mmCIF file with all atom_site columns, C-alpha atoms in Angstrom:
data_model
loop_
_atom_site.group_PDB
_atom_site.id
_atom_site.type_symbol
_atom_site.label_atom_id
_atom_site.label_alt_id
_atom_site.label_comp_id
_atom_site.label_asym_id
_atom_site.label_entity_id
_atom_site.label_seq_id
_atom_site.pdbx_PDB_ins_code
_atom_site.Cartn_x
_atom_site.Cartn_y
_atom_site.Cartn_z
_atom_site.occupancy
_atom_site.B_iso_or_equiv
_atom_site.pdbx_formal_charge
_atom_site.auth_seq_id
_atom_site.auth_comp_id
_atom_site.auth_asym_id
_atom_site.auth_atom_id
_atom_site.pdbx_PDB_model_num
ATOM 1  C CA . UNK A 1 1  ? -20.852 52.546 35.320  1.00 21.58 ? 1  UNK A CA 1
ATOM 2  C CA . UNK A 1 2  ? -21.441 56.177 35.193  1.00 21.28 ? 2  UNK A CA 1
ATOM 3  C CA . UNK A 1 3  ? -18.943 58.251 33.496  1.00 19.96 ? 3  UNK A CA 1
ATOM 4  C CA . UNK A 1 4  ? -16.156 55.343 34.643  1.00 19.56 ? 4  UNK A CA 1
ATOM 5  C CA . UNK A 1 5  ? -16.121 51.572 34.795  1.00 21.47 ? 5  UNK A CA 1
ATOM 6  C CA . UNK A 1 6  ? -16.449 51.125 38.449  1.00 19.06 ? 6  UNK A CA 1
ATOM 7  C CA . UNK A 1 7  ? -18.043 48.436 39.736  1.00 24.79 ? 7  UNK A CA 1
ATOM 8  C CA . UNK A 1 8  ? -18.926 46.417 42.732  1.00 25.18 ? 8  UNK A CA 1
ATOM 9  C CA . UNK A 1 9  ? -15.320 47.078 44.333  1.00 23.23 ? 9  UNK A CA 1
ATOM 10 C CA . UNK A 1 10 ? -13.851 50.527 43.700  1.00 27.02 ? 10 UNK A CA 1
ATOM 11 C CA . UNK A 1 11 ? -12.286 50.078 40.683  1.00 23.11 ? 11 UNK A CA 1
ATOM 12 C CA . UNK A 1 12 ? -10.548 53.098 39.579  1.00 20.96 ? 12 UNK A CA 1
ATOM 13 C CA . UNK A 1 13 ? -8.071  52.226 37.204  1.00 22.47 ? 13 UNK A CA 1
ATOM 14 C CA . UNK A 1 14 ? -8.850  55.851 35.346  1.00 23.32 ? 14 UNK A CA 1
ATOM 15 C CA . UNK A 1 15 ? -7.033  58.238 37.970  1.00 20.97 ? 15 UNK A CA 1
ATOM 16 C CA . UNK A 1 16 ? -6.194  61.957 38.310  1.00 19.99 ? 16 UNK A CA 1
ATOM 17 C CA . UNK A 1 17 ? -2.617  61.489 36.908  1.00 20.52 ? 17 UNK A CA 1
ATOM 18 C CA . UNK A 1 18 ? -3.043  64.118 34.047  1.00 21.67 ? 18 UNK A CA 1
ATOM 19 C CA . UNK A 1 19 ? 1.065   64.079 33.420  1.00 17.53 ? 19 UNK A CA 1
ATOM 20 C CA . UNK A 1 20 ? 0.253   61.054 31.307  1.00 20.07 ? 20 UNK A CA 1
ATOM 21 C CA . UNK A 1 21 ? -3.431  60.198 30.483  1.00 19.14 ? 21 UNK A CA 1
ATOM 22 C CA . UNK A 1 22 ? -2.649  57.539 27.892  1.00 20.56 ? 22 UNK A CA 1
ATOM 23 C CA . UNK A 1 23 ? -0.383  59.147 24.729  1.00 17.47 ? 23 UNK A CA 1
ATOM 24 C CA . UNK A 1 24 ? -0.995  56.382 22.144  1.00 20.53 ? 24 UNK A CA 1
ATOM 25 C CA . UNK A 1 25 ? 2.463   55.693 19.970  1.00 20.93 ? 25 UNK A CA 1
ATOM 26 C CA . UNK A 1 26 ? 1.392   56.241 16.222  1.00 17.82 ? 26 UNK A CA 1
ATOM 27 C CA . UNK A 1 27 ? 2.591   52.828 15.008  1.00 19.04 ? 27 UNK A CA 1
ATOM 28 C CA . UNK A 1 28 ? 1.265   53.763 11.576  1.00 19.79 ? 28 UNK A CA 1
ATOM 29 C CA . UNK A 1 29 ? 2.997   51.099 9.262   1.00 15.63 ? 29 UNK A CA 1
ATOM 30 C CA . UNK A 1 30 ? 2.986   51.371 5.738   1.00 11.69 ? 30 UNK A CA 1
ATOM 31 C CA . UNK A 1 31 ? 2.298   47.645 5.243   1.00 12.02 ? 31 UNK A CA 1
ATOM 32 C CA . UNK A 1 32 ? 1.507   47.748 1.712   1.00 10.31 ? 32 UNK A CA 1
ATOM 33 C CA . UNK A 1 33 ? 4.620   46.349 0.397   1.00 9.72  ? 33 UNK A CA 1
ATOM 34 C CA . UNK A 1 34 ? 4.058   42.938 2.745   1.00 6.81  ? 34 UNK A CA 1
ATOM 35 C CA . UNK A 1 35 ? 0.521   43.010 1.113   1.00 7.84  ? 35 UNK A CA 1
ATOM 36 C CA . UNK A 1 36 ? 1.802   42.863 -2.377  1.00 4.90  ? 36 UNK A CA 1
ATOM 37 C CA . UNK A 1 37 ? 4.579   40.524 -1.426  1.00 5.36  ? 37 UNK A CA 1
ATOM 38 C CA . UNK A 1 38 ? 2.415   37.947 -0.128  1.00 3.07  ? 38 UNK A CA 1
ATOM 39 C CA . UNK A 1 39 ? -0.263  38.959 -3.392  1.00 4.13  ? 39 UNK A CA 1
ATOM 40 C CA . UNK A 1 40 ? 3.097   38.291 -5.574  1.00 7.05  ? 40 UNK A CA 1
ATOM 41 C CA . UNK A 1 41 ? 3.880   35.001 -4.070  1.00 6.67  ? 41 UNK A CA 1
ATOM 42 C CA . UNK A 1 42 ? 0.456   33.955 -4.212  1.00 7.97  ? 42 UNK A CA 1
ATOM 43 C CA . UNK A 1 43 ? 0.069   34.923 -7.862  1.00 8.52  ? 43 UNK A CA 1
ATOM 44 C CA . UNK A 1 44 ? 3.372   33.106 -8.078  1.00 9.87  ? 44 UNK A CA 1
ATOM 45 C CA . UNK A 1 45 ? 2.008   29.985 -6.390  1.00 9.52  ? 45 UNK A CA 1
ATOM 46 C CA . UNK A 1 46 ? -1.151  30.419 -8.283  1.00 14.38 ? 46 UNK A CA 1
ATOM 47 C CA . UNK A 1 47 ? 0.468   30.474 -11.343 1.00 16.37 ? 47 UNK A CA 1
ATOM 48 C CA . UNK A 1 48 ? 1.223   26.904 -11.597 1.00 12.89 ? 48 UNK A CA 1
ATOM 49 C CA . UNK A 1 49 ? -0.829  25.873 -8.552  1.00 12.06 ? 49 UNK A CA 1
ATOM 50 C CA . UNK A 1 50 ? 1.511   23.524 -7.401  1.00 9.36  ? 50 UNK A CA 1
ATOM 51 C CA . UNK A 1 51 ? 4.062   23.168 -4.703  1.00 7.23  ? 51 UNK A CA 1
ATOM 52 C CA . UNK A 1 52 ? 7.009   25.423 -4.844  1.00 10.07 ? 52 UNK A CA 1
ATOM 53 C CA . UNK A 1 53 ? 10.037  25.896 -3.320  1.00 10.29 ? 53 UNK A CA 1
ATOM 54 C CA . UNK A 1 54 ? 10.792  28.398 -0.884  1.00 9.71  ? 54 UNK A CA 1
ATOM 55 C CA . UNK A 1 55 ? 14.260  29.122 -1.928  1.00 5.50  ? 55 UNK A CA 1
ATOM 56 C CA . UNK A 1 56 ? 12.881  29.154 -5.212  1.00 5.76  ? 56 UNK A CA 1
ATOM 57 C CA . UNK A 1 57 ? 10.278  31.665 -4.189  1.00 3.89  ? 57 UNK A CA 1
ATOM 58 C CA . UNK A 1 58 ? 12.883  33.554 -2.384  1.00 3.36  ? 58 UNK A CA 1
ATOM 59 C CA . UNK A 1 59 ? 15.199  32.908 -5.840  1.00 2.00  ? 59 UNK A CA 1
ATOM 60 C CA . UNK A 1 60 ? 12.676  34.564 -8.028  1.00 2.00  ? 60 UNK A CA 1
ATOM 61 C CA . UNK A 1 61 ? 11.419  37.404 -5.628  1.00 2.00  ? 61 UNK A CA 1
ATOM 62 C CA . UNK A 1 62 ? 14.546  38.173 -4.689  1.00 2.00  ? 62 UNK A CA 1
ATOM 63 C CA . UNK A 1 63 ? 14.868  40.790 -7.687  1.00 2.00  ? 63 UNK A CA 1
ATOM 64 C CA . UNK A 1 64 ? 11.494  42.148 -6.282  1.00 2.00  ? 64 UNK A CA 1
ATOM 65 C CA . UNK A 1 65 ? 11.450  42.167 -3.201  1.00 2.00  ? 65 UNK A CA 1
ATOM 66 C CA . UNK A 1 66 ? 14.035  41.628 -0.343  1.00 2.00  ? 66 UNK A CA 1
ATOM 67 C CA . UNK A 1 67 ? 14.247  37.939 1.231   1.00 2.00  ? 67 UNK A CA 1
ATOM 68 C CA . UNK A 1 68 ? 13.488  39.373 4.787   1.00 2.00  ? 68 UNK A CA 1
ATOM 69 C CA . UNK A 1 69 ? 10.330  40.853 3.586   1.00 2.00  ? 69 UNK A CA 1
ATOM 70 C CA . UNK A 1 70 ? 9.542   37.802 1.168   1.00 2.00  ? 70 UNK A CA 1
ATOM 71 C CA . UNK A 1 71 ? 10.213  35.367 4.466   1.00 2.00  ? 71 UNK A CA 1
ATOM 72 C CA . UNK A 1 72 ? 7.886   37.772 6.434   1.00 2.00  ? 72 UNK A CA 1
ATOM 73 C CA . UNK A 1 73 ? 5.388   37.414 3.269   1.00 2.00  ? 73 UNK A CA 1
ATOM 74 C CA . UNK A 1 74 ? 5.117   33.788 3.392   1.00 2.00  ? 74 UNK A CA 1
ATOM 75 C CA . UNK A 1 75 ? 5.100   33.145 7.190   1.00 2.00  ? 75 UNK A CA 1
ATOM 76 C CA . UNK A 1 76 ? 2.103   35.801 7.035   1.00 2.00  ? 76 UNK A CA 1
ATOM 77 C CA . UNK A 1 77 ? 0.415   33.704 4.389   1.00 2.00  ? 77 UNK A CA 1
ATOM 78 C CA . UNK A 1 78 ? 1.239   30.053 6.228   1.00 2.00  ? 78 UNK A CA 1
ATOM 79 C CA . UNK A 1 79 ? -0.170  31.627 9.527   1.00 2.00  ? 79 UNK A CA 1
ATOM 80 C CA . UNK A 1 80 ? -3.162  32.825 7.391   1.00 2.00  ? 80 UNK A CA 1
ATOM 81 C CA . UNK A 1 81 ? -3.146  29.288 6.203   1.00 2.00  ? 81 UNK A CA 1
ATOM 82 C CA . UNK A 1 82 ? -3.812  30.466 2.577   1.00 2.00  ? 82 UNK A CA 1
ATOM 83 C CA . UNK A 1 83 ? -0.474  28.288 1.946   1.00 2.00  ? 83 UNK A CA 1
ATOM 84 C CA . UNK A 1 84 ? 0.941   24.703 3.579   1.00 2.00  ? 84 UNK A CA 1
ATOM 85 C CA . UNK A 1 85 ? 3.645   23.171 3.012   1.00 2.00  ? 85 UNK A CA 1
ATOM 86 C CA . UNK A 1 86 ? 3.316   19.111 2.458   1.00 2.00  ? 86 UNK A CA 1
ATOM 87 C CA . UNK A 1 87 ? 6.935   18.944 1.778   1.00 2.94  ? 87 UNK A CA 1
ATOM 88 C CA . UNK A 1 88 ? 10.235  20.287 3.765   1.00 5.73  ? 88 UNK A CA 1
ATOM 89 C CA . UNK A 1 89 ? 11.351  23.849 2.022   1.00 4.75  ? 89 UNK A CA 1
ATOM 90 C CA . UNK A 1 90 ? 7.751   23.107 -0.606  1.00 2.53  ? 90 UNK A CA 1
ATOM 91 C CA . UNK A 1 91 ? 4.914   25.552 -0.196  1.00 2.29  ? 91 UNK A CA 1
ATOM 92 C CA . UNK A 1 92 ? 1.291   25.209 -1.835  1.00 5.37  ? 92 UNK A CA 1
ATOM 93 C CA . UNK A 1 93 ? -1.432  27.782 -1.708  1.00 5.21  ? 93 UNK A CA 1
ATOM 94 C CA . UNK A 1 94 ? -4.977  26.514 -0.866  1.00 3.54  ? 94 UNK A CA 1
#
């Protein structure tokens, strides 16, 4: 539209209100350390590019990084799908 996006029907979802505009929450995550836990359990994985545990992942990591963050780390790399797991508590990277 011009200046707004108002269409057919009056839509004016953009009004005078100028106590609050829109104020965006700086959600500005340093998620680095998630990036090089999943990059350490993938070079783990990689390593012998076979099936491993996930206690034993969270058994070795767990003087590198903290479980939470290791169990966050591998849940972002199974939704990725970069890993499965073909067995219970066994996780393979692709």
């Amino acid at each position: 539209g011009t200046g707004g996006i108002m269409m057919e029907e009056r839509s004016i979802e953009e009004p005078m209100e100028e106590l609050l505009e829109e104020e965006i929450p700086e959600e500005k995550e340093e998620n680095e350390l998630l990036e090089k836990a999943k990059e350490d359990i993938l070079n783990i994985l990689r390593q012998k590019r076979t099936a491993i545990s996930r206690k034993y992942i969270l058994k070795k990591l767990g003087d590198k990084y903290d479980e939470e963050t290791i169990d966050d780390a591998i849940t972002e790399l199974l939704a990725q799908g970069e890993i499965y797991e073909p067995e219970t508590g066994y996780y393979k990277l692709l």
